[PDB]
């Protein structure tokens, strides 16, 4: 067969231990990426999952051939026979290729020596998240790659203009986040082994607050509104208003405890913590109001009208705090 003899001739004398142009010029690699999906963003572990088709193109003069056939299309059989770049992902915690039913790789060789090599990958990549504005936070998660052993004098990577592309984002596994956009960069990173061309893709994600509105904000606001009902009960009903106060305080404590379950153990105040703390202050003040009213009415003996004052003061203060909080955190 014509293809068999061509393949046999190409491999005669080939040494995959050496680059193309080992001592002439750097090997130029053109990279391309199709994003099948961006998996869940694990805020606890500061990582996210991504599934890609990753493609690399370069030139190998040793693989030139003259024939009527202009391109050879090959499965993963010949991948281990020729030189391949040692590309690796710098910020990857765990990555794996796909091997069912066969290895998910493809090779293509043109008559002029151009080699295209593509494979399917699933990568867990670290993404450090600043959660000061949680649950109204936005992040720019990177995905970086470079050659492990070859410095800039030997391998140089490059984007194919419209390199990174995505499919239907509606089918992705993002639930707490919405995909805003992406961008690509290239730079040179200095290490003890030399200087390396590092290429990065940044994905911009914005959190969706709908889950947390149901989980934390609405229950806390409802408990705060429940605490105000004490202002309308008769002051002589000592156990009733005390029961209201302690129930609201305990429920707020429980809500505060469970609000932090999803987050990691950061050591700074998030926007949710401020809201929960302010709700706690308001319910505690509601209980203290009845405490001082009871003490001044009975135990000790404008003060008598404290319930009338509180009926106006507490809802107005709560509304003002909500206005300031939401205006500060959403718009400004």
């Amino acid at each position: 067969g014509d293809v068999t003899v061509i393949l046999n001739n190409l491999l005669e004398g080939y040494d995959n231990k050496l680059r193309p142009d080992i001592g002439v010029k750097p090997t130029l690699i053109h990279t391309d990426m199709y994003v099948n999906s961006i998996g869940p963003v694990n805020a606890i572990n500061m990582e996210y999952t991504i599934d890609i088709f990753f493609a690399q193109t370069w030139y190998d003069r040793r693989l030139k051939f003259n024939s009527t056939i202009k391109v050879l299309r090959l499965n993963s059989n010949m991948v281990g026979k020729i030189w391949i770049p040692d590309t690796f992902f710098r910020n990857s915690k765990k990555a794996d290729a796909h091997w069912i039913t066969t290895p998910n790789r493809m090779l293509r060789i043109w008559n002029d020596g151009r080699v295209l090599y593509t494979l399917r990958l699933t990568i867990d990549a670290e993404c450090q998240l600043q959660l000061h504005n949680f649950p109204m936070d936005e992040h720019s998660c990177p995905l970086e790659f470079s050659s492990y052993g070859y410095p800039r004098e030997e391998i140089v990577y490059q984007w194919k203009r419209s390199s990174v592309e995505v499919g239907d984002t509606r089918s992705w596994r993002l639930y707490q986040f919405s995909f805003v956009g992406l961008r690509n960069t290239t730079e040179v990173v200095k290490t003890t082994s030399g200087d390396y061309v590092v290429m990065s893709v940044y994905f911009d994600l914005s959190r969706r607050m709908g889950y947390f509105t149901i989980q934390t904000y609405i229950p806390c606001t409802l408990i705060v509104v429940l605490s105000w009902v004490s202002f309308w009960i008769n002051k002589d009903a000592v156990p009733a208003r005390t029961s209201l106060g302690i129930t609201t305080v305990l429920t707020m404590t429980t809500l505060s405890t469970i609000a932090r379950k999803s987050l990691p153990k950061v050591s700074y105040v998030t926007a949710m913590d401020l809201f929960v703390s302010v709700c706690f202050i308001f319910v505690f003040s509601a209980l203290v109001e009845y405490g001082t009213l009871h003490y001044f009415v009975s135990n000790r003996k404008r003060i008598a009208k404290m319930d009338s004052y509180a009926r106006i003061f507490f809802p107005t203060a709560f509304c003002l705090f909500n206005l300031v909080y939401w205006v500060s955190y959403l718009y400004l």
């Binding site: 796909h98 969706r208 889950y211 208003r241 029961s243 429920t251 999803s262």
Partner: protein
């Protein structure tokens, strides 16, 4: 020895065979006929939006290079020889790290007919994406896909077809069901073409239709909420002077509704929209809070701090006593009727669709 002829045939089969090239290269398009026997439809994970399925995957094609003649009609090939022969590079487009079983040996088989027809079967456990829209949860239905095709060969090189007609080419075992909270209503089978920067590829798709079973959630969430709402209304029948008791009723029912709402969302993934269960819980919370507000309104108009003594007589409008609240009497009829109407509307709206 009568086995020398078979060894002779097996030895000469791969003389001059190049497994780097597909059969019929440069002459025609390789034709692959596929069929699937689902031995069990595995569990469905809502948190990961993933489902598992264990299958016998069978492919068949023709390779004229591997023709032979002899007394035998079909030759079985071992794993070492099967690795020296071209096979299609099928892969699942929405795969999530499937597994090929290897106990006690690699569970795969290759058979060659004298006319060069290759049959290749394997046993797989495929984990696949099933994206879901949980707006109608827990009364939602899904169509989980399974798409597969060649990775490296475009439609001009390799094409896939179903062995039988597409409806009968995917067979699900009758007893092979591992679903707990789902019912497999049926499946649809189709084929098509997908574009990509590398070219056009043939794709074979199978959709499995699933419907969630509501029985678990009725016991877990709906009935406790209904009982809590009914319990909150029992406070209407107590005397208005029992201020601590009715306050206990209100606060305990509100706390119970809050706890039920918090516990209910633990089953789902953390989606950012309201489901059908969320609306039911919200309406029940509204009813409970309204009952507490009703008690507060009743207490506002109560004059005397003492209840009826037991022996005195109450004339029609000496010691006097509070009257039975008109708000309580109307609430006793208004609250249950409105809750029943809401239940009728909700269950008619969501179950019919």
């Amino acid at each position: 020895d009568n086995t020398t002829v078979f060894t002779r045939i097996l030895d000469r089969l791969l003389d001059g065979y190049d497994n780097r090239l597909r059969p019929g290269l440069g002459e025609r398009v390789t034709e692959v006929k596929t069929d699937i026997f689902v031995t069990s439809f595995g569990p469905v994970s809502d948190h990961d939006m993933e489902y598992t399925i264990d299958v016998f995957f069978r492919q068949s094609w023709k390779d004229e290079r591997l023709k032979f003649k002899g007394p035998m009609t079909v030759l079985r090939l071992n794993n070492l020889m099967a690795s020296k022969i071209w096979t299609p590079d099928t892969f699942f487009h929405n795969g999530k790290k499937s597994v090929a079983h290897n106990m006690t040996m690699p569970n795969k088989l290759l058979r060659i007919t004298e006319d060069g027809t290759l049959l290749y079967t394997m046993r797989l456990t495929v984990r696949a994406e099933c994206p879901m829209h949980l707006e109608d949860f827990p009364m939602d239905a899904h169509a989980c896909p399974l798409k597969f095709g060649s990775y490296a060969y475009t439609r001009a090189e390799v094409v896939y077809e179903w062995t039988r007609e597409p409806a009968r080419s995917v067979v699900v075992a009758e007893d092979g069901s591992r679903l707990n909270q789902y019912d497999l209503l049926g499946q649809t089978v189709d084929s098509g073409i997908v574009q990509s920067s590398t070219g056009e590829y043939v794709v074979m798709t199978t959709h499995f239709h699933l419907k969630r079973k509501i029985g678990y959630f009725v016991i877990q969430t709906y009935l406790p909420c209904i009982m809590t709402v009914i319990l909150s209304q029992v406070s209407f029948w107590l005397n208005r002077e029992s201020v601590p008791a009715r306050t206990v009723f209100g606060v305990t029912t509100v706390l119970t509704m809050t706890t039920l709402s918090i516990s209910a969302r633990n089953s789902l993934p953390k989606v950012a929209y309201a489901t059908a269960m969320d609306w039911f819980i919200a309406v029940c919370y509204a009813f409970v809070f309204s009952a507490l507000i009703e008690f507060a309104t009743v207490n506002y108009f109560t004059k005397r701090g003492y209840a009826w003594d037991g022996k005195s007589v109450v004339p029609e409008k000496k010691k006097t006593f509070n009257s039975v609240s008109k708000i309580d009497r109307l609430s006793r009829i208004a609250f249950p009727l409105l809750f029943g109407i809401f239940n009728l509307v909700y269950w008619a709206t969501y179950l019919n669709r």
